[PDB]
């Protein structure tokens, strides 16, 4: 019966919560109470990349750590050289409503997606000296929220219908489908090992997925609102989530429980982007109050403030070698900080 | 200049790209954008019929002006997470069927939708063009059935000219921004042809008022 099944589900949830409480002994703040703080950190704007004429919704650093890609609502996808602010490529999209972008690890391909429920893949290094639409992938029934390359022939895509997918670029087919979320999925993060990946949705719950077997491993429920961003700790044994209730949360998949909460009494707006740095000592968070913040990964105390944007900060990224931080905002300016 | 041979060519290529981007944006910022947000299937598919995937897009021209209409009724997802993408749209077109009063009630749900979309924090200064359609059915339905089924506190008569005005003023007072935004109302049906003229006049008024506010005169 439905009543018996919901009763036993509640009993299982109670047992899981009791085991979670039992397997917790000491807060990480207790261990790291007496650790030398990082001190105040001052970062300055080295470059400013003009050229967009609308809001900026995504950006991704290349593996060479010199080239980057940005996507705007003016139907434009632009590739920049960060050392000297020259425009390498400018690609016009079929639909303006784009809210995600990715840059291939090899460097030959780019991907984009948005409110058209289609993921478009463009080939960069081709003859004829232009860019062409390599492949269009369709099959989702909701707007596409994130995409992340696995290799030259596999990508992972999360949609607004509550389902993620692993594709095959050579022939467009849903190789694997991941289901289990109640609300629409907002973001996904891909592990460096490329064996597992994490997903965050609007049901205030995050999940871990195995790419090969296609079955969910764990589930984390700590927030009480929508989750807007997620990323992996460089080690691969932790991750961080940002939500609309103006708090960040650092979790782990070994102990399967909460580790840290980052909040303040003077912050009310939500978080739109989260990223780590090399060695995992700094959290970078973009907020809706025109401002960006830097947090210590072991202390909840703030360390630095990045101001200079005249609107909400939407996208934030850190290079592969950890030498610069790029931010975008709803005013058409990308800023590089060092 | 301390630049190598290739660096100057790269700079020239970047300059050409900048010129092309500016030229494209200048043309893009000269067109009119309208967000079509008709509730349900209340004649929304008809107005596009005589005025001529998740998001459907329609283009048309009138008096050397380009209109782009976005229909987003096929999403069926969380409306509060992709609605901020439509800031800066010139106008919001709303559609309501007048024959659904006795059919909870459809009209009350339409009222909830209008209230929710009119008082949103992203649309505090965006004009709404409201269409009341299926009038030809409505007049005979009124002369056959009373309006008190949907409206309990209605002391007026059972004629078309009074019921239509009562419904219009019942819809038009749901806005809490009586000064920043304005509501334009029209009565149309299948046989009417002058809808495009009404849309053009309303959008020209909106553009003129925005220009006057921008230059500091207001």
């Amino acid at each position: 019966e439905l009543d018996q099944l919901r009763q036993e589900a509640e009993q299982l949830k109670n047992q899981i919560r009791d085991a979670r409480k039992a397997c917790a002994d000491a807060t990480l703040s207790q261990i790291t109470n007496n650790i030398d703080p990082v001190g105040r950190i001052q970062m300055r704007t080295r470059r400013t990349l003009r050229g967009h004429l609308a809001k900026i919704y995504a950006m991704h650093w290349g593996t060479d750590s010199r080239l980057l890609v940005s996507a705007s609502q003016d139907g434009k996808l632009i590739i920049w050289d960060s050392y000297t602010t020259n425009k390498v490529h400018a690609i016009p999209l079929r639909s303006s409503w784009v809210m995600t972008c990715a840059y291939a690890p090899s460097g030959n391909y780019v991907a984009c997606g948005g409110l058209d429920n289609i993921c478009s893949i463009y080939n960069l290094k081709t003859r004829e000296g232009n860019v062409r639409v390599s492949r269009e992938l369709a099959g989702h029934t909701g707007y596409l929220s994130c995409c992340r390359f696995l290799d030259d022939n596999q990508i992972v895509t999360s949609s607004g219908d509550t389902t993620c997918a692993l594709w095959d670029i050579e022939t467009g087919q849903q190789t694997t489908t991941f289901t289990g979320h109640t609300g629409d999925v907002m973001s996904l993060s891909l592990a460096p090992d490329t064996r597992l990946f994490v997903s965050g949705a609007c049901d205030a719950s995050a999940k871990l997925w195995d790419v090969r077997e296609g079955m969910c491993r764990q589930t984390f429920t700590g927030h009480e609102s929508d989750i807007n961003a997620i990323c992996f700790f460089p080690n691969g044994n932790a991750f961080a989530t940002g939500s609309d209730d103006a708090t960040c949360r650092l979790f782990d998949l070994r102990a399967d429980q909460e580790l840290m909460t980052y909040s303040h009494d003077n912050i009310i707006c939500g978080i739109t982007s989260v990223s780590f740095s090399k060695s995992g000592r700094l959290l970078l968070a973009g907020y809706d109050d025109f401002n960006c913040n830097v947090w210590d990964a072991l202390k909840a105390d703030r360390a630095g403030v990045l101001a200079g944007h005249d609107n909400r900060v939407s996208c934030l990224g850190v290079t592969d070698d950890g030498m610069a931080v790029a931010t975008g905002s709803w005013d058409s300016f990308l800023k590089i900080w060092n | 200049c301390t630049l190598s041979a290739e660096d100057k060519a790269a700079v020239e290529r970047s300059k050409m790209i900048d010129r092309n981007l500016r030229e494209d944006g200048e043309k893009a910022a000269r067109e009119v954008k309208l967000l079509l947000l008709g509730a349900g299937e209340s004649g929304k598919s008809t107005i596009v019929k005589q005025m001529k995937t998740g998001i459907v897009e329609t283009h048309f021209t009138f008096k050397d002006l380009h209109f782009k209409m976005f229909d987003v009724g096929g999403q069926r997802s969380e409306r509060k997470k992709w609605i901020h993408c439509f800031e800066g749209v010139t106008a919001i077109i709303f559609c309501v069927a007048l024959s659904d009063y006795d059919l909870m009630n459809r009209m009350h749900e339409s009222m909830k939708l209008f209230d929710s979309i009119c008082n949103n924090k992203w649309f505090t200064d965006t004009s709404i063009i409201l269409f009341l359609n299926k009038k030809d059915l409505f007049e005979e339905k009124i002369k056959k059935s009373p309006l008190t089924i949907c409206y309990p506190e209605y002391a007026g008569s059972n004629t078309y000219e009074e019921a239509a005005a009562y419904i219009q003023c019942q819809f038009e007072d749901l806005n809490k921004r009586k000064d920043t935004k304005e509501i334009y109302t029209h009565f149309t049906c299948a046989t009417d042809t002058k809808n495009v003229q009404f849309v053009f006049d309303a959008v020209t008024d909106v553009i003129i008022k925005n220009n006057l506010k921008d230059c500091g005169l207001f």
Partner: single-chain antibody
Amino acid sequence: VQLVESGGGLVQPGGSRKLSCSASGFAFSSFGMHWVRQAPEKGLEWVAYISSGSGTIYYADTVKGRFTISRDDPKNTLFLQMTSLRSEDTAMYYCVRSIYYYGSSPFDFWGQGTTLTVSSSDIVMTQATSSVPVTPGESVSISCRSSKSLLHSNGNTYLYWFLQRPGQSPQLLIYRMSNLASGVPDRFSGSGSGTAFTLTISRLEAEDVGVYYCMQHLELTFGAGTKLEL
């Protein structure tokens, strides 16, 4: 992709003629264009350059004010005004494309060329050995030397190693050192050590056999024509 040459032939000194380079199979409006000359008794020699959009035009210091070059993007063609010709202009003419951005590989594609029979502070490079035996199938290391150091302040070793096959048009072997792009086989590797240059091909092939031409692009003079026999 193909480039077809039209014009040329028997010309009296100081004549006037049209030279045309027709392109088909690629985006012509985004590529800069070069004209290259090869004398029957000599090697290659640069003539003229124009960029995309007719931005800048460059001529050789020995032909400055003698020729001129134009580009027609809507008609998709390249034109040269063959005028004021001396007695030493009889040669073979080649049309070359080149695109410059970060990571690009210019000088990739060459035309067939046209024959011309006429009636009757620069950097100079050198080659240590003017004739070397070659066995394909092994690893080959190649290097050229010049009158200046080719390294720029940006820190890239910067020199082009190029091949001419006997009987047909030349083709590209490697562009500036330490960088390998698409369009060429993966066997190539480049390296630089200030004044030490190195091109390494692990699997030498008959494709990489012929006459080379170490070339500079800093400030375009070709190296001495050295045919490495088999």
